[PDB]
Ligand binder design. Structure first.
Ligand SMILES: CCCCCCCCCCCCC/C=C/[C@@H](O)[C@H](N)CO
Ligand SMILES: CCCCCCCCCCCCC/C=C/[C@@H](O)[C@H](N)CO
Ligand SMILES: *C(=O)CCCCCCCCCCCCC
Ligand SMILES: *C(=O)CCCCCCCCCCCCC
Ligand SMILES: *C(=O)CCCCCCCCCCCCC
Lengths: 4, 279, 62, 235, 266, 279, 60, 62, 60, 62, 54, 4, 4
């Protein structure tokens, strides 16, 4: 996943 | 690991330990195993009681009500444009009898609703798909006087709007009892007659009943306005207790039920005839 | 929040611990399914509710 | 194509469900909040504020300002009750329309302690002692001071502190009572009697009003939301 | 020891001081003392005027008389002060205005008189009209100024459907707006019960759904005074005693200056 | 942890602390607990106020509108081939009364739409499944003059196209107020009459109304062209406030509503008769 | 739009299934349990208690 | 982005902290469900909005 | 067969929704952009340019 | 491949950064939804496209 | 962070900087803000242009 | 994920 | 997740  | 205990091998005995004799007067059951009275071999036991836990004994939807509701032109006579059912498991017998193996219970309740419809008249055109409103009316809330009065606005009561032909509707309800467990049996009254009462009606109440309205009612209506042909529907309600705890076991009902109390009336002869010495 | 537990396998394919997964989707516990991983107990409170419980090899009335 | 199987309940609409749905006006620039005085977090905060009880619902008094006034006087019959009331806070007609009774009428069950505060509105020269009592249910409703004083009670001495509070402790068999009237969950009786009498000097009014207030204590809660019978709409 | 009591108070604002020796403590509505708009809650961008002591001072309205048949009185704020010194001038010269208030209601009698007044401060006090037409009370009738209005014991519908009065018809046990008077105690309030006290003091923050608004179009607070227990004295049947209302603007700020608003009242 | 406070054990008292006496003139409620006036035992309290939070009190879809729309041959008379509803919670009473326990509110709004249809004529053939367009027209956008004019192109207004028989449609809307909270009560006018006005109509406006068009309208139509038989439908709209904050509590409405303001007219006698000394 | 494919069994109701469903009375304050004597965990506990046999089912 | 919280369990099966999982699928917060994990407050601003709040054992009017 | 339950809103079309859908011309070789002068990022940029007011809307 | 971003919250429940999750299911970017996390720019190319841009306090014609 | 710029507080002026005069002949729009021609207070601006992006 |  |  990749939180921004 | 849930298997029952293994049988131990045991051989002959000649002793002062006498497990076969007992005195049932004490109120106790003699805990014998086959190796107390016969020679046994060792058996590694793999059977389990997985299917007779309280949860597995009750884990089935059981039919508790069939509610009939019509969709036709509002005439001036008595019609069934909406129907009300007082929530209970005592209108049918099968789930009632299983719950009544116990005096008290605590559980959450799953309700599943199966809805079926049919035409009644050979033909006055047809009908477009119906939507049903099942509104829960708790003790104290206003009950509908007609199928479209203001109570159906349901601002606080919960309602299900079910579309015909969709999968059966389903909801869960928490443990909603006023006490710490539900009482399947209540040996008492809701009122007591006092010596100073003006008349005997004041303290009179039904034996073994508790509150008057109990859990309230389900009010069911077809939301659609009527078609020219009449359509009759039935809502069948299935209850399944889940997350179940039960206390104080009881003999099961052995003669037909006669009302919501323990009263009996007919078929008080459950046992058949068999000779004392006939296999 | 996935709970993973073992299944008790009955018939076995000609292929071990097989697991299954559960996630609760609702805040209210009444919405939950039943886990059916239920423990049992001793029947003694019904079969032997005696103040002095005696051993089965000894006489019940002494 | 993740393989899926639809369960019972699919496509129903439960009006108490709690699900997400697409936003019809996306990326709207919402006006931020400001700090308005008076924010409420729980409906029970409103049931804890004293509101005045319509104690006098006699024929000519109900639905007038006089339903709030109970007359005390120095010539009252001292053996008779000043007022009598059942502890059914959402149902008894004197309690059902107070702020406490209006909030409980949206719930099916209630539990907790309640407090009744009475205000004396006579002149400063009037004195008196009053017994206000609570009888847990199950016996004959008090008709005399002699019976009322055997239950929970407060003897109020009138004086500079104008008001007196009686707390009706939660004393119940069930863990929650019903908000409708039911004998299985009945709550008991409140009665009030003169302990001595109102005494006034000359040139002073011999009659005066007493006003009464009710609110919930901090152990009070309600459950099972339901519609009220207090509002309707005709076709 | 030296003697401070919650019955004896002095209030000083601008060039005006009030003393009372028979108070019953004082209420700060919703626990909020008035304050100016903070920069992070600000909305009009022009620099506000803050007249300070010229407008935040006690103005006494005309006295009303409480007799045995009085049903009650009501005033709206800022309307009751629209003609008060430089508060009224700033109110009408500016599109926007914001203010909190200290309200001090005065009623003394004697140790042989009895009666109790309920003094309620109500945010957005909408009142009911006199006819079949809904929301029809006119601007001039909804805004009586310092004169205030009165309550009635019953709904008297205006029937001259030809030249309708377009007035409010506030029925007292319904608080003039369709709710029961007994529940008005959820609003900030005090009671002047003559055996106990001779005044009520209530401090009101500005309450609205906006940080600042038009004072000419909108009243933020209503003051309702109703006899909870009627006036009585000795054995006389026509006792009357004065009720005087003194109100002071607090933390007044105004935005949007231009020519003066001149409403048509008559 | 959300339980209410425990009851403390307390015993006899003979002292100068007198919690039972107070002065309600101050404007305060006496915060007594049972242990201030009677002897209490210790009780570990487990009840909570979980169901009376502002969110749980409003967390129900409440019916706010029933919109009727027909699908039949466009004749020259007045028909209901499309319908418009000005968005409001004041056409019904139940949700209106719960919101009006408060002066101001701030919330997002969930709308769920239940659609039902029926035939009206005994038979002129049948109808194929209908699709409904519910278009939101904000204040200022062009309103439709016929069921298929250009406004239904909906390039910027949001529309829902609902297919009959599908699960009820549902959308959420943000807090869209022009102020920092919604005003449930507005003691004022949208205009002021000035002395220099040419006539009295210029500054006249309705008491307690704010904007004219408020939130706009929902325009509903059946997208299908007509069948030979006429089909009537009703769209029922359910509103649920979510993510709710409320300010300044008010007495609840005690006499019937008479319009969108606070006006009253009949049944101004809510309390029944009961003797002063009758239990 | 997660792509999904409905399998056989979709929309049936099996009365012995075991699934979740929405709670109709959310946030209800449930009454806690108390320790009642006599709790039963398995139906076989009842079959282990001696009960009296109707051994004589002759006519009369 | 899954949030995992504890359920407050009412009836217990004869089987501890049971959790439930939530994921928000939409960018606009108006689309979100309600978390119903709501805090409460003190009624004092309504029950005791007095400038000098006095203790209940002391006289209200001194 | 992941067990699923369809909620309200299922199968509706909201014209302001924002979802994925299958691409009808897969693997298309898109023409890359070039730097055209005059790019606009927000409609409010156009409201900030002075435009001439039709101040005189008298009859003629 | 889940992207987690913050929502800009409008109305707040009486309960912080609330996040939402996105996964693209298709290979072609035309299938994607819009992220609506859009940056802006300076209007100068339209409001001040002058060869010598002058400061607003100075005379426009010198 | 997407809010529009804050209004700065500004007071009286008596100077040779004249932002109110300009020459639209150049083809440019005068970038004034209210604090160039009136006295303003400080306002922490929270509005954004989220809904008028392309 | 984030347990709370 | 939590295996049991
Ligand atoms: C939208 C549909 C909602 C349906 C809500 C139903 C609420 C009531 C559930 C009751 C379950 C009843 C089980 C039986 C209990 C009784 O044995 C005892 N009389 C209680 O002491
Ligand atoms: C495709 C369908 C879209 C539907 C869009 C609806 C937008 C409007 C939502 C309004 C919610 C209204 C709640 C009430 C507010 C009022 O109390 C006050 N008059 C505002 O000051
Ligand atoms: C524990 O839950 C860790 C994360 C599990 C990830 C899979 C979640 C599947 C979707 C659950 C949605 C529940 C309703 C919003
Ligand atoms: C936090 O979100 C970490 C990753 C969670 C993985 C499960 C995601 C389930 C699908 C969400 C899709 C949302 C709409 C594209
Ligand atoms: C990033 O994607 C890490 C893994 C996310 C796991 C959840 C996936 C949900 C299913 C996506 C299927 C797409 C079509 C085959």
């Amino acid at each position: 996943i990749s939180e921004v | 690991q849930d298997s029952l205990p293994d049988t131990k091998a045991s051989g002959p005995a000649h002793s002062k330990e006498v497990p076969a004799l007992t005195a049932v007067e004490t109120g106790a059951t003699n805990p014998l195993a086959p190796s107390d009275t016969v020679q046994t071999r060792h058996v590694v036991q793999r059977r389990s009681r997985s299917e007779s836990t309280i949860e597995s004994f009750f884990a089935r939807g059981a039919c508790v009500a069939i509610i009939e509701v019509d969709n036709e032109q509002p005439t001036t006579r008595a019609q069934k444009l909406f129907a009300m059912w007082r929530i209970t498991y005592k209108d049918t017998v099968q789930l009632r009898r299983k719950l009544e193996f116990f005096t008290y219970s605590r559980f959450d309740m799953e309700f599943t609703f199966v809805v079926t419809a049919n035409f009644t008249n050979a033909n006055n055109g047809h009908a477009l798909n119906q939507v049903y409103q099942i509104m829960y009316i708790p003790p104290g809330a206003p009950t509908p006087k007609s199928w479209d009065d203001y109570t159906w606005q349901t601002s606080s009561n919960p309602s299900i709007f079910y579309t015909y032909g969709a999968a059966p509707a389903r909801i869960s309800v928490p443990y909603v009892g006023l006490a710490n467990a539900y009482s399947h049996f209540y040996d008492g009254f809701a009122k007591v007659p006092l010596k100073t009462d003006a008349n005997d009606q004041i303290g009179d109440s039904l034996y073994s009943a508790m509150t008057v309205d109990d859990f309230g009612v389900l009010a069911v209506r077809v939301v659609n306005d009527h078609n020219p042909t009449k359509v009759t529907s039935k809502v069948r309600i299935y209850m399944k207790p889940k997350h179940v705890r039960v206390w104080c076991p009881r003999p099961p009902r052995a003669v037909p039920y006669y009302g919501p109390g323990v009263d009996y009336r007919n078929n008080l002869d459950p046992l058949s005839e068999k000779g004392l010495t006939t296999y | 929040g996935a709970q993973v537990s073992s299944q008790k396998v009955g018939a076995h394919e000609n292929s071990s611990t097989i697991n299954y997964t559960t996630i609760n989707y609702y805040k209210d516990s009444a919405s939950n399914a039943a886990s059916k991983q239920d423990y049992s107990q001793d029947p003694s409170k019904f079969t032997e509710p005696l103040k002095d419980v005696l051993i089965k090899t000894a006489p019940a009335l002494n | 194509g993740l393989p899926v199987l639809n369960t019972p309940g699919s496509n129903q609409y439960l009006t108490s469900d709690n699900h997400q749905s697409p936003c019809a006006i996306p990326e709207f620039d919402v006006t931020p909040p400001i700090d308005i005085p008076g924010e409420v977090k729980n409906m029970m905060e409103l049931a804890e504020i004293d509101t005045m009880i319509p104690l006098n619902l006699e024929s000519t008094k109900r639905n007038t300002m006089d339903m709030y006034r109970v007359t005390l006087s120095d010539s009252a019959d001292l053996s008779q009750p000043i007022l009598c009331l059942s502890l059914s806070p959402a149902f008894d007609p004197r309690l059902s329309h107070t702020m406490l009774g209006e909030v409980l009428n949206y719930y099916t069950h209630w539990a907790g302690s309640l407090k009744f505060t009475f205000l004396f509105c006579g002149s400063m020269m009037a004195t008196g002692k009053i017994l206000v009592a609570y009888a847990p249910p199950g016996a004959q409703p008090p008709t005399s001071r002699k019976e009322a004083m055997l239950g929970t009670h407060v003897i109020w001495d009138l004086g500079l502190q104008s008001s007196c509070t009686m707390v009706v402790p939660w004393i119940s068999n069930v863990t929650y009572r019903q908000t409708t009237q039911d004998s299985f969950t009945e709550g008991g009786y409140i009665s009030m009697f003169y302990q001595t009498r109102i005494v006034v000097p000359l040139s002073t009014p011999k009659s005066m009003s007493m006003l009464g207030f009710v609110s919930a204590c901090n152990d009070f809660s309600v459950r099972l939301l339901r519609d009220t019978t207090h509002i309707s709409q005709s076709a | 020891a030296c003697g401070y009591s919650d019955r004896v108070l002095q209030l000083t604002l601008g060039n005006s001081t009030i003393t009372t020796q028979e108070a019953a403590n004082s209420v700060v509505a919703y626990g909020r003392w008035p304050e100016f708009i903070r920069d992070d809650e600000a909305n009009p961008v022009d620099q506000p005027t803050e007249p300070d002591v010229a407008t935040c001072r006690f103005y006494t309205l005309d006295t009303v008389m409480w007799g045995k048949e009085s049903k009650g009185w009501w005033w709206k704020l800022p309307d009751a002060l629209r003609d008060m010194g430089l508060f009224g001038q700033n109110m009408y010269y500016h599109y926007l205005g914001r203010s909190g208030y200290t309200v001090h209601v005065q009623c003394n009698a004697s140790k042989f008189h009895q009666g109790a007044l309920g003094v309620f401060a109500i945010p957005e006090y909408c009142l009911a009209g006199d006819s079949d037409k809904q929301r029809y009370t006119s601007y001039a009738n909804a805004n009586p100024g310092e004169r205030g209005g009165k309550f009635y014991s019953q709904f008297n519908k205006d029937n001259a459907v030809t030249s309708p009065k377009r007035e409010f018809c506030p029925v007292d046990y319904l608080l003039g707006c369709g709710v029961l008077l007994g529940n008005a105690f959820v609003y900030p309030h005090q009671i002047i019960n003559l055996r106990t006290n001779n005044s009520a003091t209530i401090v009101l923050p500005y309450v609205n759904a906006l940080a600042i608004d038009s004072m000419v179009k909108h009243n933020n607070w209503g003051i309702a005074i109703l006899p909870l227990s009627p006036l009585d004295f000795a054995q006389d049947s026509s006792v009357e005693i004065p009720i005087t209302v003194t109100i002071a603007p607090m933390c007044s700020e105004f935005n949007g200056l231009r020519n003066v608003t001149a409403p048509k009242f008559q």
